[model samples]
Target chain A: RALRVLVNMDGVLADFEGGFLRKFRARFPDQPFIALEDRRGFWVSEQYGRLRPGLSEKAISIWESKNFFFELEPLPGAVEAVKEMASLQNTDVFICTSPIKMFKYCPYEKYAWVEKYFGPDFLEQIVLTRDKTVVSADLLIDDRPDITGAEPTPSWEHVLFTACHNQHLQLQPPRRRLHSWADDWKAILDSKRP
Target chain B: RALRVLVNMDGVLADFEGGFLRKFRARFPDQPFIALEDRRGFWVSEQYGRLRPGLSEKAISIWESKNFFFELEPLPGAVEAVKEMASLQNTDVFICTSPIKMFKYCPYEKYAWVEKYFGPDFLEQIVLTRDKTVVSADLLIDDRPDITGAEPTPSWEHVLFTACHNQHLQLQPPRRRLHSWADDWKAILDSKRP
Candidate 1:
C-alpha cells in the first residue's frame, strides 16, 4: 500500500518568513522588522502588529500582492526532500496548502512555484484547500501545531514540519517533529508504510 | 456525524458545456461549432477533434485565456442548490475541482466564480486538485463517468451529475445519477445520511 503523504507549502517547503521579510523590507524600507530566527510564533499578524500601528496590515499587503508568492525561494532542502520523498518506495506525495482570503494570486503562484522547483509532472500532486482535514492522507507534514476542520477525526496523522516559529514545543504520540527536510525525514514517512 | 459531501465545479456547478459552446462560438465564429444539446461524452477535445484537425487546440486556447472561467454563467439551479445543500442539517459540502494543466487562470477564476455566486464564506469550502480521489467525502456529485486516481478506493460514492455529454449512460447502485441541480438531488444525498 502506498503511504499517502500530504506536504504543507509555505513554512515547510517555502521559506515563508525569509521571503516575507525580504518583501516586507523592500516594500517598507523604513519599517522595523523581525529576523527569521527571532520569530517566536507562526503568524506574522501576531508578531508584526506589535511592531507598529499599521505594520501588520502592511505585511499582509505584501502577502496579497500579485507577485509575492511567485518570487519565493524554496526552503533550503525542501525541493530535494520532496523529490526524494516522492521516489521512495510505496509512497505518494501531494502538496497541500491553504490559500489566503484575497486569493487571486497565491493559488496560481503556488502552482508556478511547484513547477519551478519540481517541474510540470509535480503540478498534478498539488492540492489547494482551506480545510486540510478533508484530504485523505496517511500523514500530513505541516508546520502548524494545530490542524482541525469539519472532519472531526481526520484520516492522516499530523506530523509537525519544523520551523523557527513552531520550534521549542514537544510533540506527542501520533505526532512527531520533523527537524528539517534534510534531517531523518525519510524515516518519518517510511515508518507509516504498510 | 456530518455527512461530508464533495461537489465538482466545472460541469456540476458551473455551466461547462453551455459556457464552452458560447465561448467557442464567440472566439472562432468562422469555425463550425457544436451546440450544447448536440454534444455527447465528456471531453471537448474528443468531440471537437473529430470535427477538424486543429479545432480542439483552438478550443483549448479559449480555456487557457484569462477571464474565460470567471465570466461563466452558473448552470440552471446550480448556485441555489449548492447554498441549500450546505445549509442542510449534518451536511458538510465542499466544492471540489480539478484545475487543468495550463491552470494559471482557472483556479483563481473558479474561486471568483464561487464568490460571485455563493459569496465569501463558501471560499473556505473550495478544494482545487488534479486528483479528486484524495479528498474525503461521503458523496461526490460530478459529471464525469469515470474517476480513477492513485487511491484505489476513494472515500466518496460517485453520483453522476447529468449533463448533455453524459446523458445516455446508465448509472448502477452506489452510483446514482443526478439529472440536474433541481432534480431529486436532495433525495440522493439524503439517502446517504447516517
Candidate 2:
C-alpha cells in the first residue's frame, strides 16, 4: 500500500486568512487594518487586539453562514500542489479537516467547497473530524500546533504548514515547518521517497 | 466535558440488512432467498453461497444509488435509543459511519439521510471514515467486529451492536455485546454511570 499524506483544508489549502480579512472588513469597515503578519495567536481576539469588540462572535456567525466556505478562494499554489500530490504513484493524499465546533452547515458546505474546487476525484478523500491526532497517516501537514498534541507513539510525522498565527512556534525534531507549498512541496515529496 | 458516544449507522441504526434483502430479492427474483440468520461471514459470497454470482458488485451498485440510504427505514427502537442518548445530560452522541468504499454518492447521500431522519441536530455529528478504530470516543457501538483493532492504550470501549452478520464472533474482556436496543439501551447507559 502507498503511504498516505494527510493535508489540512483551512489554513493549508483554502485561504482562511484571506476570507477572514475580507469578511472582517465587510463587517467593520471603519476598524483599523490588521495585517496577517500581526496575528500572533489562533483566535480573532488575539489577532486583532483591541481594535474590534466581539470579533470572535462575528467570525463565528460568518463561518456558520451558508456561504462562508463556498466563497473561499484557494491559496496561490494549493490546487496545483494538491493535484501534483494526487498524481504521485506511491502516495495517497487525503484532505483531513476539522469542522467548525458550533456550526451546523460546516460539513456539507465543506464537502461542497471541495467538490466545486477540486472536482469529483477528491470527494472520497475528505475526512472531517474534531481530533486530528486520531487520524493515521504517513505525513500530516496542518497549521495548528495545538492539535499536534503529545502522542506517546505517534503515527504520522507532523509538518507545520506555515501561517501568520502559527509563525511564532518553534519546530522540534521529526517535526518540520513548511513555509510555502510553491517552494516546499517538492521537497516534502522527495523526503518521503524510499 | 461530556462522554462522547459513537454509534454506527447501517446495521445498527438503519435497516441495512432489510434493505439489502429487499433489493436482493427484487434483483434476483428466481434465486433462492438467504435469511439473515444464515450469514456467518462478512462477505456477500459467504452468506449467499452459490445463489447469486457477483453479489458484492451488485450490492455496491445498489449502495451507490441515490435512493439506497434515503429510502432506508430505521431499525426497531434505534431512533428512540439514539434520541435518548442524545438527550442525556452527560453524553454527546455522534453517528460514526464508514462510506461505501467505491461509491461516489455515499457520503452526500448518507448526510442527506441523516438530515431527513435524525433532523438537523444530528447532522453535524456525522463522521464518515473508512477506519472506525481511529475515532476518539468514550464508547463506540458498532455492528462490525473486524474494525476493533489492537490499540496500545484504548480510548473507547467497544460494544458490539448486535447484527445477524456478526453473531458468530466471540467477545473479549472490556469488549461487551449488546443484544437489542429494545431490551438493552437503558442497561448500557446505566452501566456507564460511576
Candidate 3:
C-alpha cells in the first residue's frame, strides 16, 4: 500500500513571504519591512500591520492581484525535496492548498507556479480547497499549526512545517515538526513519532 | 458520521455546454453547431471537430479564454439541488472539479462561479483537482465514466451523472446513474441500490 502525503503551498513550499516582501518593498521603497526570518505569524499581513497602521491593507492589495502566486519563488530545495518524496517506494505525494478568499487569481497562478517548477507530471497532484480537513492522506506537511474544517477528524496526521509564524507551536506525539525541505521527511513519513 | 458527496462542476452544477454553445453560435453565426441537447461526447471539441476540420481547436480557443468558467450558466435546478444537499443532516457536500489543462483562468473563474450562485457559505466547500481519485469521499457524482488518478483505489463510489455524452454508459450495481438535478439524489445518497 502507498503512504499518501499531502504537502501545502504558500509558506510550506512556495516562498509567499519572500514574494510578498519583494512586491511590498518594490511598491514602497521607504516603508519599514520585516525580513523573511523575522516573520512571527502565519499571516504575513499581521506582522507587517505592526510596522505601520493600515499596512496590512496595503499588503492585501498587493497579494490579491493577478499572478502573485505564479511569481512566487520556491523555498530552498522544495522542488527537489518533493520530487524525491514522489520517487520514493510506495510514497504518494500531493500538493494540497487552500485558495485565498479573493481567489480571482491565486488558484490559477498556484497551478502555473507548480508547472513552472515541478512540470506537467506534478500538475495532476494538486488539490485546491479552502478546507484541508476533507482530503485523506497518511501525512500532511503544512505550515499551519491547526488545520480546521467541517470534517472533524482528518485522515492524516498533520506534520507542521517550521516557519517564523508557526515556530511557537509545540505539538504532542503523533504530530510532528519539519524544519525545512532538507529535514528527514522520509523518516517522518514512515514513523508514528511526533 | 456524514456522507461525503463530491459533485462535479461542468455538467452537474454548471452548464458548460450551454455556455459553450451560447458563445459558439454567437461567434460563428453560420457554422453548424450542436445544441446543448445534442452534445454526444464529454469533450465539446471532439464533437465540434467532426463538424469541421480544426473546429476542435476553435472550440478550445473560446473555452480557454479568461472568465469562460466564471460566466458558465448553472444547469436547471442545480443550485437548488446542491443547496438542498448542503442543508441536509449528516451530509457533507463539496464542489469537486478538474481544471482544464491550459488553466490560465479556469481555476479562478470556477471559484467566482460558485460564489456568484452558492454565495459565501459554499465558498469553503469547493475542491479543485484534476485527478478526482485522490480525494476521499463517500460518493462522487460526476459526468465522467472513468475518473482516474495516481491512486489505484478511491475512497468514493463513482456515481455517473447522465449527460448526452455519457447516456450510453450502463453501470452495474453500487454505481448509480443520476439523470438530472431533479432525480431522487437524496435516495441515491442514502442507499447503494445503484
- i-RMS values of the candidates, in order? 0.8, 5.4, 1.3
lDDT of 1 at B98: 91
Candidate with the greatest DockQ versus the true structure: 1
TM-scores of chain A across candidates: 0.95, 0.89, 0.91
State candidate 3's TM-score. Answer: 0.89
Pairs of residues clashing in candidate 2 = none
Per-candidate clashes come to 0, 0, 0
For residues B105-138, what per-residue lDDT tens digits would candidate 3 score against the true structure?
Answer: 8887888889899997788899998878877888
lDDT of 1 by residue, A1-194 (tens): 78899999999998888889998898899989988777877788779998789988998998999888888888888988899889987889999999999978999899999999999999999999999999999999999898999899999988898887878777677568888877888887767776
The top-ranked prediction according to lDDT is 1
List where candidate 3 sits over 4 angstroms from the true fold: A25-38, A47-53, A190-194, B28-38, B47-53, B192-194
Error of 2 at B128 (Å): 2.1
Q: Candidate 3 docking category?
A: medium
Task: Give per-residue lDDT, candidate 1, residue B94.
Answer: 96
lDDT of 1: 0.89
* Candidate 1 vs. true structure, TM-score: 0.96
List DockQ, one per candidate, in order.
0.90, 0.21, 0.73
Q: B7-117 in candidate 1: lDDT tens per residue?
A: 999998887787788888988999988887788888887889898999989889888888888988888899889899999989999999999899779988999999999
In angstroms, the error of model 3 at B111 is 1.4
- Mark the 10 consecutive residues where model 1 chain B has the least summed lDDT: B168-177
* Candidate 1 vs candidate 2, TM-score winner: 1
